[PDB]
Design an enzyme around this catalytic site. Structure first.
Site, mmCIF file in Angstrom:
data_model
loop_
_atom_site.group_PDB
_atom_site.id
_atom_site.type_symbol
_atom_site.label_atom_id
_atom_site.label_comp_id
_atom_site.label_asym_id
_atom_site.label_seq_id
_atom_site.Cartn_x
_atom_site.Cartn_y
_atom_site.Cartn_z
ATOM 1 N N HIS A 18 0.828 -1.214 0.000
ATOM 2 C CA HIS A 18 0.000 0.000 0.000
ATOM 3 C C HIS A 18 0.871 1.277 0.000
ATOM 4 O O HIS A 18 0.409 2.334 -0.421
ATOM 5 C CB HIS A 18 -0.885 -0.008 1.252
ATOM 6 N N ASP A 60 -0.280 -7.813 1.244
ATOM 7 C CA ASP A 60 0.156 -6.432 1.416
ATOM 8 C C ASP A 60 1.625 -6.359 1.875
ATOM 9 O O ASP A 60 1.903 -6.126 3.050
ATOM 10 C CB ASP A 60 -0.788 -5.670 2.385
ATOM 11 N N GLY A 86 0.039 6.249 8.973
ATOM 12 C CA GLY A 86 1.434 6.626 9.144
ATOM 13 C C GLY A 86 2.253 5.471 9.679
ATOM 14 O O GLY A 86 3.465 5.403 9.441
ATOM 15 N N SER A 137 1.515 2.318 8.842
ATOM 16 C CA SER A 137 1.425 1.321 7.759
ATOM 17 C C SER A 137 2.791 0.862 7.275
ATOM 18 O O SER A 137 3.642 1.697 6.991
ATOM 19 C CB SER A 137 0.655 1.898 6.574
ATOM 20 N N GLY A 138 2.974 -0.450 7.191
ATOM 21 C CA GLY A 138 4.223 -1.062 6.732
ATOM 22 C C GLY A 138 5.242 -1.297 7.826
ATOM 23 O O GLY A 138 6.292 -1.890 7.574
HETATM 24 C C1 SH8 Z 1 -1.092 2.408 3.218
HETATM 25 C C2 SH8 Z 1 -0.612 3.841 3.233
HETATM 26 C C3 SH8 Z 1 -0.050 4.422 2.098
HETATM 27 C C4 SH8 Z 1 0.367 5.744 2.096
HETATM 28 C C5 SH8 Z 1 0.234 6.498 3.253
HETATM 29 O O1 SH8 Z 1 0.709 7.799 3.236
HETATM 30 C C6 SH8 Z 1 0.685 8.610 4.353
HETATM 31 O O2 SH8 Z 1 1.235 9.678 4.243
HETATM 32 C C7 SH8 Z 1 0.076 8.056 5.575
HETATM 33 C C8 SH8 Z 1 -0.010 8.853 6.811
HETATM 34 O O3 SH8 Z 1 -0.997 8.953 7.494
HETATM 35 O O4 SH8 Z 1 1.194 9.385 7.140
HETATM 36 C C9 SH8 Z 1 -0.404 6.789 5.574
HETATM 37 C C10 SH8 Z 1 -0.321 5.952 4.416
HETATM 38 C C11 SH8 Z 1 -0.739 4.618 4.383
#
Ligand code: SH8
Length: 224
Positions: A41, A83, A174, A176-177
């Site tokens: 993602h 994922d 943020g 994620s991963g």
């Molecule tokens: C799954 C995912 C992809 C890209 C993302 O970009 C972001 O900037 C955030 C965030 O809340 O910092 C989350 C993301 C999640």
């Protein structure tokens, strides 16, 4: 990370952040000097990888560009199955006490196991509060039978659920991963959950790393 606390300094040398325009995009984990493991993602054409500091914005951190990445071919943007993605760093990560490879799993940890999820994601939801310091929270592995009661047939066997009963403790945007570590090994990558984050009895859903060992090792070997 929701309802957590700052990680003990120096206890997550394998934690990385993927940045875009000097803003946090995703979390990730250092597999070896050349590779970062994260969620599919998180795909981008270019990444800036932060390594070697619990503080985002720390001048002491390494900042390495990454121009190549490889999502698992089974990845679905519809269901978030498979994922996971390997990010190839443009130059080698310089290892030290603050930059170390994660321990990949040999076995799958069972339901009930205590784990730690970490990240620079928002500590509040829906309202965002992005921290400077790396945040930690302890969660327990939830059985696929219990997790199915919440997410039904959206759940697959290569996904792993974790949470605490009647608790807001969880990962959020943020994170994620990023890593879910249990008994010294990487068991999960932050993948998805409910929105707003931190909803009690809605488990966090993770990519179950123990199911992907072959693909991870083969991909690094092929694109070395
Ligand atoms: C799954 C995912 C992809 C890209 C993302 O970009 C972001 O900037 C955030 C965030 O809340 O910092 C989350 C993301 C999640």
């Amino acid at each position: 990370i929701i309802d957590g606390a700052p990680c003990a300094r120096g206890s997550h040398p394998w934690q990385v952040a993927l940045l875009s325009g000097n803003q946090l995009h995703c979390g990730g984990v250092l597999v070896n000097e050349r590779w970062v493991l994260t969620a599919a993602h998180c795909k981008m054409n270019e990444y800036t990888v932060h390594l070697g500091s619990d503080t985002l914005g720390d001048r002491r951190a390494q900042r390495i560009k990454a121009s190549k990445s490889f999502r698992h071919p089974g990845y679905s943007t519809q269901t978030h199955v498979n994922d996971l993605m390997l990010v190839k760093l443009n130059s080698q990560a310089r290892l030290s006490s603050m930059v170390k490879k994660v321990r990949l799993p040999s076995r799958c940890e069972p339901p009930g196991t205590t784990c730690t999820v970490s990240g620079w994601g928002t500590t509040t939801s829906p309202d965002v509060t992005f921290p400077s310091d790396l945040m930690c929270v302890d969660v327990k592995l939830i059985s696929p039978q219990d997790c199915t009661k919440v997410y039904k047939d959206l759940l697959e066997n290569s996904m792993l659920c974790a949470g605490i009963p009647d608790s807001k403790k969880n990962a959020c945007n943020g994170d994620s991963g990023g890593p879910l570590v249990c008994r010294g090994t990487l068991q999960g990558l932050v993948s998805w959950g409910t929105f707003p984050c931190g909803q009690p009895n809605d488990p966090g859903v993770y990519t179950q790393v123990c199911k992907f060992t072959k693909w991870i090792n083969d991909t690094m070997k092929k694109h070395r």
